[PDB]
Amino acid sequence: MPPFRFKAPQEVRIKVPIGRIPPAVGPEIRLGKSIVAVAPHRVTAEQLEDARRVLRRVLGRSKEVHQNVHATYAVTRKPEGTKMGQGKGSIDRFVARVPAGRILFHIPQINPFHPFPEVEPNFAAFKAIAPRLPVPVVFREQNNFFQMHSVKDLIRKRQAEERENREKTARDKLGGFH
Amino acid sequence: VSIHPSYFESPHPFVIWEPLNEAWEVYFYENLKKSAKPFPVKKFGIARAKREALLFLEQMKLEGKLEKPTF
Amino acid sequence: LQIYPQRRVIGHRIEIFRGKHRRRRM
């Protein structure tokens, strides 16, 4: 129940079919900032590790980043010294079979600047890593801030009340109406 | 679904609600023996299964197959 | 392993007839 640093799933050293990447059951929602795949693809362990290192370097030691998927699915390739048709090749790499709509990385820190709605999110690390992923990506930020708590609505209502009051005083002072 | 409890009440002793199969079973006598024909909800729907069971009961009554064989 | 029948249609309802394509009874 306390916070923990769960160990990563291990690499399965079992030959498996190339197969197809099944679709996502539904939207994946996580508070904070998320980088979400937009098309299906299989991301290599090297690519995931590079993205993690870049995210850590950009954000800093004081901030924590969660890698949502892991490369456990084996993928094989033949040695150049083997002829055609002599069975499947040796394991060559490991991949995560990311569908469309799957979060790759996310940071759970909520945006503190609720009263500054015009300051839109900082996606610096996501921008740094996106052009290197083999998947198109979309940047998301969800902070559980609902419009019922919006401060801009109160600001607008106050401005409207002030305007109405000003027009009322101007009319009264000029005295063209009862 | 939402259904009134009076649906499962049968108006005749030979018409029974079987809840395992959710079917209306109608009893009758044929060839000096006792038989039961089921009318499933999965087949007819909620109201129509009961309606068809009642119609089959009337058919068996006309055929005289509701009478107890005697030896 | 089972092949599952396709239920919704793409176009028109299928219709089967005897014999090869030709002008036939109408």
């Binding site: - | 395992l20 199969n21 044929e30 060839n31 000096l32 023996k33 006792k34 039961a36 024909k37 089921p38 | -």
Partner: protein
């Protein structure tokens, strides 16, 4: 250095198991007809498998179990299937009847149904059965010609040849 499996070409397995039912519902059968083919060999992690072969069916009314666990008929009748909710298995029964026309109004007797116990399975078989041996019934369009010829003579005989003479049917009540 690739180890070619023994079951590679040309020495693969010629004949497949073909495990499963061999007669559908409402079909007419006589003693000795194999209703379901099954095998004794069992997989080593059966509870994790998903193919339908590994999960056998169960005998019911007028059905025996063979040496290799095939389900075979024991009386002249029509096939029926049942689902055992308690054990979550399929049960094969044969309702005894003499050969006669299979009418549309009688097809409900061979529906697959859910039961909780084999006692209820027997009760349902009695309730759907057409008639009892000691009382019989009026046969509706029963066959009157001799049976199909032996397979080794002709595989494609004709059923109820009008040119053949009527012969008594005195075997389908046993």
């Amino acid at each position: 250095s690739y180890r070619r499996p023994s079951r590679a070409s040309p020495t693969g397995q010629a004949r497949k198991p073909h495990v499963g039912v061999r007669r559908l519902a409402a079909e007419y059968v006589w003693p000795g007809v194999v209703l379901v083919k099954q095998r004794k060999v069992i997989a080593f992690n059966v509870e994790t498998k998903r193919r339908n072969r590994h999960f056998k069916l169960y005998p019911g009314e007028n059905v025996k179990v063979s040496k290799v666990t095939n389900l075979v008929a024991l009386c002249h009748g029509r096939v029926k299937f049942t689902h055992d909710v308690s054990r979550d298995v399929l049960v094969v029964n044969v309702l005894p009847e003499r050969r006669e026309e299979l009418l549309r109004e009688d097809l409900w007797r061979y529906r697959t149904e859910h039961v909780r116990s084999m006692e209820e399975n027997r009760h349902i078989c009695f309730l759907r059965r057409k008639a009892v041996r000691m009382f019989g019934k009026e046969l509706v369009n029963p066959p009157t010609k001799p049976p199909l010829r032996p397979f080794y003579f002709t595989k494609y005989d004709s059923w109820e040849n009008p040119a053949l003479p009527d012969v008594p049917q005195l075997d389908d009540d046993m």
